[PDB]
Amino acid sequence: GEIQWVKPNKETGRLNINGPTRTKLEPSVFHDVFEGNKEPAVLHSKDPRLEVDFEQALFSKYVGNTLYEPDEYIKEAALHYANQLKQLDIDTSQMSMEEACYGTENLEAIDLHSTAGYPYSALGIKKRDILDSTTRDVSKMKFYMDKYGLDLPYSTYVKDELRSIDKIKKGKSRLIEASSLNDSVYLRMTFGHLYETFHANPGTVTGSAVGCNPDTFWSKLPILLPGSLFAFDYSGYDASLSPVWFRALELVLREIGYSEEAVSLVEGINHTHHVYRNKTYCVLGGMPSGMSGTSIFNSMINNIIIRALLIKTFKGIDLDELNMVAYGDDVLASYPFPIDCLELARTGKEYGLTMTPADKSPCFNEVNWDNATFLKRGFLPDEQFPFLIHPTMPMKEIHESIRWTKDARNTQDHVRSLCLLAWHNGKQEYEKFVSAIRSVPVGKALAIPNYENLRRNWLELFH
RNA sequence: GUCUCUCUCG
RNA sequence: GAGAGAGA
Ligand SMILES: [Zn+2]
C-alpha cells in the first residue's frame, strides 16, 4: 500500500473527522501486584513520550507497492484456492438489505454502537437514527444510500490500547479505518452469504479461522494440520499489500461464480480515500482496517499468498497437500515435508511482504506443536484426555492487561475474562494468578472462577 | 473509537 | 436490551 496524495479538507470538501486524544486507560488496583511494561498508546502528536514525529510514524506502515498484475504463480495460487472454495457452494447472489442490516444465523446484525462512519459521524447522525432492531426498517437506509451514495472515505481513528514502550517512543500506534455505513451495507449485500459460509466453517476448506472459538477449535487444529507445521509473522501485513493481491482476489471471486458487478467492488477496496483530522488522503493498495469483511478478505488473500509463495520458491510443490488456516495475517499451515520459511520470506520480499520468524528470534527455526502459536495462544494437550487441546495464553499478556482499566467499575468482568483465558495454563499457574489477585483488598471482593468448574465446563463442550 | 469469539448485567 | 475482555 502507498499513499498517493494528501490534501487539506478545504481542498477536497470533506468533513473533519476527529477522535479522542486522551487515553481512557488508567492504572488499576493490580498495577503493582503484577509486572508489566506496556502503557497506553500515543494518541496525540504532542505526547511527551514520543521520540519521533507522530504522524510520520502513523503512516510509515504504507511501505509502497511492488507488483500490480498477477504473475503465473499468483494466478495458479488463486485458481487453486478458488477451486477449493467451490465445494462450499457459496451463494453468490446478493443478500437482501434487510438480512444485511439486521443479521442472519451466521452473520451478526450491524452493531448499533459502532460508528456509522463518514459523513454521519461528522454530522451527528448515529446508527440508531437509521436502523431499528424492532421494526427491521430498511426504508431510511435506502434513503441514505441514495442521499450519500458509495465509495465514501474511510474515517481514520487512532486506537486507544496498551503498547510496548518501544512502540510508544516510535509513535507506532494502530489505526482504525472505519468504512461508512453505506459501504458496509453495500459490501454485506454483495458478500453477506460468503461471510455466512466463512463464519460457519472455520477450518482448512475456507482456510480461515474467522468465527472460530479457540476453546473448541484448538482440538481440531492438529487434525486439520497434519504433518510438518510452518508459520511466520508479517510486519504490517494489511498496509504492505500491493494491488496484485486485490487483482488475485478478483480472480478468486470470479472463479467461484460472482457477477462482474460484485467483483467490481474489489477495486473500491484496493483504491480508497481516508479522512484523518482535517486532511484527506488516497491509499492505493493496502487493506483498510475497519472495513466490513477486513478479516475475511485478509484471510482469503493470505490463502493466495501462501500458495503463490510455495510454488514460486520450491520446485515440485503439490498444493493439494497444503493445509492452512488464516485469521487475517495470522497463519498456521502444514505440509507433508518441512517448509523452509527463510526461502518463503525471500520470495515474499519480492511481492512486497516482510516476513519474520514465528518465534520472534532472528532465525527461522522449526515450528512444532510445542512452540506454535495462533491468535496469540499456544497448544497444550490436556493431561487427562490428550486429544483435547488447551489454547494457552502466556501469563505475561494477562499480567499486562490486568494492571490497567478503562473504568474500574468493570473490574469484576475484566478479571473474570482474564481468568477464563488463564486457567488453560494449568492448575498451579492459575491458582498462583488467583493468589496474587486476592493479595489486595479489591481482589478479595471479586467472584473468581474456580479451576475445577472451569475445567469441567470446558470438558462438557466436547459433550 | 473495525470485526470475530467469550464472559457479565437488566 | 446494556457492558466488558481478549484476539486479528
Ligand atoms: Zn485516490
Side-chain angles (χ1 to χ4, degrees), chain A residues 5 271 273 282:
Chain A
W5 49 260
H271 177 200
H273 293 179
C282 172

Side-chain angles (χ1 to χ4, degrees), chain A residues 169-260 262-314 316-395 397-408 410-427 429-436:
Chain A
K169 290 175 176 177
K170 287 135 131 168
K172 292 209 127 48
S173 300
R174 292 199 299 174
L175 299 168
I176 295 160
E177 293 139 4
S179 83
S180 150
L181 179 63
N182 289 21
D183 292 296
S184 294
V185 170
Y186 186 43
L187 277 159
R188 287 162 68 93
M189 293 182 68
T190 305
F191 302 111
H193 290 316
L194 174 152
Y195 296 172
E196 292 171 326
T197 297
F198 272 58
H199 296 165
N201 295 282
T204 47
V205 177
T206 57
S208 157
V210 181
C212 85
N213 170 18
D215 264 11
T216 50
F217 195 60
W218 251 228
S219 295
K220 305 187 202 176
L221 273 172
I223 312 302
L224 299 171
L225 303 177
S228 277
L229 293 180
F230 64 101
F232 53 86
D233 296 335
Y234 295 97
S235 312
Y237 174 89
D238 293 40
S240 76
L241 291 173
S242 292
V244 63
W245 299 118
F246 298 92
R247 306 282 81 81
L249 176 62
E250 285 164 344
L251 297 180
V252 172
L253 297 173
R254 226 168 260 142
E255 178 74 15
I256 64 172
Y258 271 101
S259 79
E260 294 287 15
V263 177
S264 83
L265 275 73
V266 174
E267 173 63 9
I269 313 171
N270 181 56
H271 177 200
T272 55
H273 293 179
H274 309 253
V275 176
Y276 174 63
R277 305 250 271 125
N278 62 354
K279 295 169 180 209
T280 305
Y281 57 109
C282 172
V283 177
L284 189 58
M287 183 79 64
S289 72
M291 191 186 77
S292 158
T294 286
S295 294
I296 282 168
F297 293 131
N298 271 337
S299 305
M300 294 179 68
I301 285 173
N302 222 338
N303 274 268
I304 307 168
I305 288 171
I306 299 299
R307 286 165 170 85
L309 291 181
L310 285 169
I311 52 175
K312 188 170 212 288
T313 89
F314 303 114
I317 291 300
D318 182 11
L319 284 184
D320 286 358
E321 299 285 336
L322 165 74
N323 312 96
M324 67 171 280
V325 304
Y327 196 128
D329 64 290
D330 204 358
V331 178
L332 192 58
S334 79
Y335 194 75
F337 310 105
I339 291 298
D340 193 336
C341 298
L342 190 271
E343 311 301 339
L344 285 194
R346 189 167 163 87
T347 309
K349 184 144 281 280
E350 313 183 49
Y351 285 153
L353 304 166
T354 302
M355 306 162 36
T356 63
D359 71 356
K360 316 260 191 294
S361 90
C363 312
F364 291 91
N365 299 301
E366 194 194 81
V367 177
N368 48 62
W369 288 106
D370 281 353
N371 65 22
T373 64
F374 188 50
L375 312 182
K376 250 164 170 205
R377 296 130 155 121
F379 298 78
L380 176 62
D382 192 69
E383 286 186 332
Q384 208 189 336
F385 309 102
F387 46 93
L388 303 182
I389 308 287
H390 293 269
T392 52
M393 172 144 291
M395 290 304 305
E397 291 309 289
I398 301 167
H399 289 166
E400 298 274 356
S401 171
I402 195 165
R403 298 175 73 243
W404 301 81
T405 182
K406 294 188 214 123
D407 189 350
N410 302 311
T411 302
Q412 165 78 71
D413 279 7
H414 183 183
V415 171
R416 177 174 169 88
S417 288
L418 289 184
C419 287
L420 303 203
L421 297 165
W423 77 273
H424 285 289
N425 293 308
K427 171 91 157 127
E429 280 267 280
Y430 182 70
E431 295 297 340
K432 175 184 157 146
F433 186 45
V434 173
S435 286

